[PDB]
Every structure is written in C-alpha cells, then in structure tokens.
Subunit: 145 residues, 2 copies
Amino acid sequence: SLRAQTAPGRWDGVAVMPYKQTAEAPFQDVSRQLLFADPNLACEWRYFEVDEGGYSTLERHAHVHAVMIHRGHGQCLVGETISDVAQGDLVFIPPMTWHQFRANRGDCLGFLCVVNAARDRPQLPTADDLAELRKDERIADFIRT
Amino acid sequence: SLRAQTAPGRWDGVAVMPYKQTAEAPFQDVSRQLLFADPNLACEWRYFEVDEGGYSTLERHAHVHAVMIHRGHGQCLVGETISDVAQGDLVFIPPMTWHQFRANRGDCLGFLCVVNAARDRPQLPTADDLAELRKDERIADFIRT
Ligand SMILES: [Mn+2]
Ligand SMILES: [Mn+2]
C-alpha cells in the first residue's frame, strides 16, 4: 500500500487526531497520527505534531521511544539534558527517563515516534518529582505542566 | 541521546555502510544506516539510500516492511503494483510479497525502513519465480536482477 504525503505532516488516508485540550491538561496543542500498526509488526509508528508554542506531556515510563524529528524545530528535555531539535534529528529516550518536547523556537514541531506495541502507560510527575527536577535551574525554566 | 541530521540522509554519529557490490549482486549502489536498534525495542529502524540509477534487491519474506520515503524520489514494486514514490510517502509491504525499489527517476532515493528485530531471512527469486513474475509485461520491464 501507498499513502502519499500531501503536505508537511499530512498524508492521504491518515487522520489527524487532536488531543482534547482541558484546562488541567499537562500538554498543549498536540495531535496524533497513526502511520503504521499491523498484527505482524512488533512496534507502532506514529507522528505527533505540537503546534507553535505547545508542548507534549512531561512523563516517564519503562518503554523506550525512538524519535525522529519530521517537521519544524524546537527543544526537548530528555533526562537531565535539554537539546535543540530540528528536522531529521534522532532522539532515543531510554527507560524511566523524564522527557518533554516543546515547540518553543518559533515554529511547530512534528516528530515520528516508534514504540513497542506492548508497553506500559506513562507516569506523570508527583509533587516530589517536580521538586527533584527543579533543583536544576535550566530544567525548572524549561518544563511545562 | 541525540544524533543530529547533518545533511539529507546523514547524521552525526551514524556511519554510512555501503552494500559491497559484487558482479553477481542482485542490488546496485545501495547503502544502509542503522538509526535505532536496542534490546528494549522490538523493531530495527534503518535508512536505505539507493544512488541514482540503483535498486534494492528483488525479494520476499514473511516479515513486513514499514517504509517512509526520506530523500529524493523513485519507484517501487510491491506485489503487482508499480508506484511513484517521493519524500514522505508511506509504503507498507505485506507478508511474502515480492518487492523492489528503484532510483529510476533522475535522483537518489532514500527511505526509512522499520522491521521486526526477530524476522525471517529474505528469499531471492528462483528461475521459476522470475518466469512467473515476467508473465506480466509491466513487471518484466521494471524488475532488476
Ligand atoms: Mn513518552
Ligand atoms: Mn525486504
């Protein structure tokens, strides 16, 4: 099968699903698209798009993420490290490592994400976790809840 | 971890690995790069680059392919269908289905390829396979052995 790209981050036969934005939401202006999932494929391949100014939810989990930036640019926190990310960049997120993506560089930020089909659910930071992370000033300034 | 894109189809800390070209090789002018492989990731994510005029090997196997075009443009054979492919296009190759990619449109063709870490080996065509494929005139003209 062929599903042609029709615009940056858009494809024929792939539906854009925005995440429902509630006042309490730990994320801002994010959508998801399912590019590949099949009973014979052990992983699922998605594309997430963070509107300009937005961010993905700060979280951690046992399952790893293989990410490639697909559209725009921005920044990410992985563990202790805040990186600039641009089109094509490869980010590996190892187990139980805090992470968050921000479209904080004047553009939207879209990335491919490959994860195992069988995986644990995300864990959000407790009050304690946030105090731990805010011991680093750079991280305190960067993170969004 | 971050490995930044440095040019189209190139990344900091990723080695380009050309397939060594024999006289009898069933491919032409192809390289592969390993983007992601990890004990905790059920799939392997590679980038394959076919120089202008080259092709990947005509083959089939039970294991499926999830492909996203990354660079340039070209054509692929999937089963009985020959398609034009360009940057961003999604191709899915189902089980035991003959396939080949050709950089036969004036440019190199680079693509991301996700497959299971544990998978079966590729099967190359026998004379009878080739005979059987070449019954269709359009496939006979397209394939490269
Ligand atoms: Mn996550
Ligand atoms: Mn194959």
